[PDB]
Paper text:
F-type ATP synthases are energy-converting membrane protein complexes that synthesize adenosine triphosphate (ATP) from ADP and inorganic phosphate. These universal enzymes function by using the energy stored in an electrochemical potential across the bioenergetic membrane by rotary catalysis. Here, we investigate the mechanism for the generation of the unique cristae in the Apicomplexa, using a combination of single-particle cryo-EM, cryo-ET and subtomogram averaging.
A large-scale preparation of T. gondii tachyzoite mitochondria and subsequent mild solubilisation with digitonin resulted in the isolation of intact ATP synthase complexes, which we identified as native hexamers. Refining three copies of the dimer model into the hexamer map resulted in a good fit and showed that it forms a cyclic trimer of dimers. No additional subunits or substantial conformational changes of the dimer units were found in the hexameric assembly. The C2 symmetry axis through the dimer is tilted 22° with respect to the C3 axis in the hexamer, thereby bringing into proximity the lumenal regions, which extend 80 Å from the membrane. The hexamer model shows that each of the three dimer-dimer interfaces contributes ~1211 Å2 to hexamer contacts. Those contacts holding the hexamer together are found in two separate sites in the lumenal regions, which form a triangular subcomplex.
Author numbering:
A (entry chain O7): 9 to 157
B (entry chain X7): 2 to 83
C (entry chain K7): 108 to 224
D (entry chain S7): 33 to 64
E (entry chain P1), F (entry chain Q1), G (entry chain H1), H (entry chain I1), I (entry chain O1): 96 to 166
J (entry chain B7): 263 to 314
K (entry chain D7): 42 to 104
L (entry chain C7): 32 to 153
Write the structure that this text describes.
Amino acid sequence: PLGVKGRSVFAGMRSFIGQRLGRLYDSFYYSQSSTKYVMVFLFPAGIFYTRFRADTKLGYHVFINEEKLYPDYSQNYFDTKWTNGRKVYLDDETTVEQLKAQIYGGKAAPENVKVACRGRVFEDADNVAMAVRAFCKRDPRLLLFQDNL
Amino acid sequence: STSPGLAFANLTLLLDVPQLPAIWAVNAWRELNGLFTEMKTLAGTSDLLYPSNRYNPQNEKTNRMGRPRKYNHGEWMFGNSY
Amino acid sequence: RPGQGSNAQFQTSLADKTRGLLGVGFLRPTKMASFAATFLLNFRFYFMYMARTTFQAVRPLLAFSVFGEVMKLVLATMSSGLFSFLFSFVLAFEVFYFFLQCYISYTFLTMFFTVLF
Amino acid sequence: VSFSQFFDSEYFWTKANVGPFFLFLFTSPFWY
Amino acid sequence: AGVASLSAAIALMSVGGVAQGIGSLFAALVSGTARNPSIKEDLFTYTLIGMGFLEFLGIICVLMSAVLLYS
Amino acid sequence: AGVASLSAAIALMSVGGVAQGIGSLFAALVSGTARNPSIKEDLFTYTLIGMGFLEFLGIICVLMSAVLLYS
Amino acid sequence: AGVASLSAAIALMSVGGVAQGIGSLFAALVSGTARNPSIKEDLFTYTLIGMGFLEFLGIICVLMSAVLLYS
Amino acid sequence: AGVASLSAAIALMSVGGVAQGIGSLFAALVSGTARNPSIKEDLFTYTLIGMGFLEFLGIICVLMSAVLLYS
Amino acid sequence: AGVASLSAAIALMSVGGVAQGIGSLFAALVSGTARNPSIKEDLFTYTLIGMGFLEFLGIICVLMSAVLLYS
Amino acid sequence: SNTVLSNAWFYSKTFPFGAVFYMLGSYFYRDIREKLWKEEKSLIHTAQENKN
Amino acid sequence: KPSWHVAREHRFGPTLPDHAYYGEHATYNYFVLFIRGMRPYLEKIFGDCASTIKNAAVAVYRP
Amino acid sequence: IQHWNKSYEKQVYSESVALNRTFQARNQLVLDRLKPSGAYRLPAVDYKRQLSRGTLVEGADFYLPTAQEQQRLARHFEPYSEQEQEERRKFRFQSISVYLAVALGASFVHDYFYQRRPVAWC
Amino acid sequence: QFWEAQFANRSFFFFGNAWTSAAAFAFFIWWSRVFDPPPKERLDRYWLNSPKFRILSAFHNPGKRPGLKISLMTYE
Amino acid sequence: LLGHTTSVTMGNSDIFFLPKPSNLLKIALPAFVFMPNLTIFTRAFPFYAHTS
Amino acid sequence: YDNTASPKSELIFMAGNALGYCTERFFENEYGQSIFMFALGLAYLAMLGHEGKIHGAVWRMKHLFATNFKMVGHPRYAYALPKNPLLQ
Amino acid sequence: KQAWHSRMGKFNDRSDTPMLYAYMNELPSWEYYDLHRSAFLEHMTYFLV
């Protein structure tokens, strides 16, 4: 005897979802504290953050011409030193000035510093996204150099 | 249960089935951004919007590549220069 | 009451109940970190297993292809009849070796694709 | 046939023809 | 193109190091067949498994020799 | 850097001791299967545990080799 | 600058002895088990202890190698 | 340039023989346990004395390595 | 008269290990024959199977030696 | 009008494999057939005895 | 491995039941019982869909 | 030494008292409020407890849903009805014609609708 | 047979070692995208340098030389 | 014809047909396991998948 | 320029990048069509082996049941049979 | 039946080759009382009284 009169398939769906959620709560309660919190919140959260950032935002590999132009990262922890090739995720509204400030930590940058991509110098009042789209399509490797000339 | 020959599938599952929530969230975010863009277009714009483009900086004072518009200081009899 | 004698002993401090609310000796974030570390370190077994699997899958391909190329070099280089007569037996040995490797691969694959449940 | 008496469990699982409904349900992405 | 040849020749040592071990495996098979001739199979399976392991090591080192000889 | 190509070979030379060890292990396994066959299910298990170590060590001897071939 | 890689490879060219020792360990385990199964729990109990030293030595045999690759 | 690193790596090579000796020790231990469990507790004592020499020599080796990687 | 000769000579160091393996093979054959002659045709068979690897490996090394002598 | 019968593939795989199969079949012609027909013979014997 | 001493972390008894650890029955398990129970609804669904498709194809093919 | 190890044990169990007090508080605050009802409990019993109860059954990886299918080997006289017999007589062999038709159709569709690729034109 | 296999144990859709499991795995990889053809954005990654592609182009252009059209297809 | 040359498509040519004579055979054959069983021990799968 | 590091969080894309590489290189082309045919051949061989098993089973059932006079059915269901009038 | 029992034992039991026994910090009742025989006695005398 499938189905009952006066009852709806949507009511049965609600029944089933309630059962499933109660069972999930029971199984989460009767589980190890050492493992369950990690496996249920911290790995899912990190994977979600990483995948969303990669699949949604757009990032750039940054290089610097000279070691004297490297930023000072001695004080901030977990990164005592600059390394070239760092992947950097930015927003579409970011400008070259904002990128430079982000690199140099909101501190005094060197003089006549400019950004290039595939040999092509960017203006400082330029959107990084559109400048890369124009000059280096699908090769976002940026370089920071000193323009004395 | 499992076996060494299923290491490919085990790794693939463990690394990919947690990403499916993120994939669906990305798809939903994209659909919503498209919806908002189309609602904006229906409302009206000075310069057009490219729907399937990453970024649309164009306005009265800005090109479709983020630069300032040339010859945009004065006014023109036919209206906008675009 | 039956259990009032035992439930009278259960009276706690403010600091006691704060510590219990926070779960000091019962959450063990160091244990959680150790679990995460061990779990991530256990990913080497997948690499080991896939390495073994690919070797057992390509063993017949190697025996059929690269030793074949060597035999082909020798065939291309040899001209006389005596050396060819002696090389026929090497070729037959390669046949038997290929079948041996195929049997071995069958064995390792039925070992690696046998599941209890 | 009414929405209610169609989606009633007995009629849905005994007398109704749910083939078109479930085919529409499967092909929902195509229509979208 | 001189360091590659020496690299391959030095990598070829594991072949000789591996031939020992195959010798011991088949010696053990022989001794087991001599001590219990009623069990020939179930000794050749383990012998072939160990041969496969040591053959895999040999293939590894020979592959890396051929690699380093041209790369 | 040709010595890189040498280093990898040297990192593979340990395989000569590895395969030998593996051989000895399986030799003992065969001897056991020739002495007390009715407990193969034990001996093979222990052998697998041993390989679970030896394999890993050999894999290191490969990996570091390749690393010294690239870095 | 490949001398660091050479030093790392040389320091890594001692895992063969660890592997031979582990093979002898598990070979004796299997032999003494086929000789007396009822006492397996002890042969294993000591076997793990031996690994508790050998693997540690191997760990050094890796670690110092890695250090010699960078420092 | 790589004098200290090369000398440390060349010094670190005896760990293979050390591990082989430890493996022989514990192989004899498990074998003697299989052959006479009633004196198991005695055998392990001597085995530990063996370690008391072997590991000691190994320690000296590593100390010399630490001395030579920094001159 | 350069590095090719050195590499083709260094490749030949594996022949010692191959010879030790062959010696182990035929020593096991001899022991099994002296123990149970009535399975000679079996043991000889297995011995040939072992040679079917060991000899082949040696030939491999010899060929690669010539390949390093005329690369 | 081809090089199939003068090929390295021919001389390496076709003739060796075929000649080995032929030699093995010629040498073990009767052992194989007997080992195969053992089961059928036993079944027919059992069936006939049961019938009788 | 059994012992008469209890460590600190294991001082306060079992907090978990047995089914929290042990695997379910091998042959009568949760999913297989579930799908055996859901067999009739799935049979209804796919039979209806197949009959609809077959009737459409026949209505096209006969004329 | 006696002094010191005795007092060591003393504040060992002091720490134990502290642990027990916080354990009680944790339980009676959080877990007695968050405890599940038992309606959605696990609908099974472990195989060890079943084995001790004398309840465990191991067999029949498969099953027979319908009684018509269950009682076939016990009826001995009508394992299959007559209608069922004539329906079964239609499947004495597999249908190579249907195999051929379906395989050709699926290959045609897969090749000329799903696996189209571009080609150059001169 | 397939239907009954789905409700048999260790015989669900692509799980197990049965022929039904193999067939379901084949249908699964077919339904997936990995074996679908590439888009036009990704043709010069493999397809325009493929022996199958070149042979088919040469066959359907009998007496001609499609190297130039292949270059132009890459450009496109 | 700049953008219309990648639109000239040609279909594949593979036919998926093979007769399946089982009357010739009387023995079973081995079969691969393609994926792990997640319908059993689902909760423990990340925890036991690395073992053997 | 080729020292393009990337965050260590993106190691979870190892298998995804691997499968994408093998798709772009093998699966979405003629070698991928060969692989699909290979999978179909695996299915074909599994089906053949299953039917061969059934063939062998029935071929033995014939010889061992059809001439017994003692197996009118299976012995596990003999309770359901009628009773012998000759036994008493 | 024997295969069933051996499979389940190999899967669930605490052994030198453990499949399911892994990442164990909070034990279940059976394993807890099998490892800590002192507590089974204490927990059992309390229950009966």
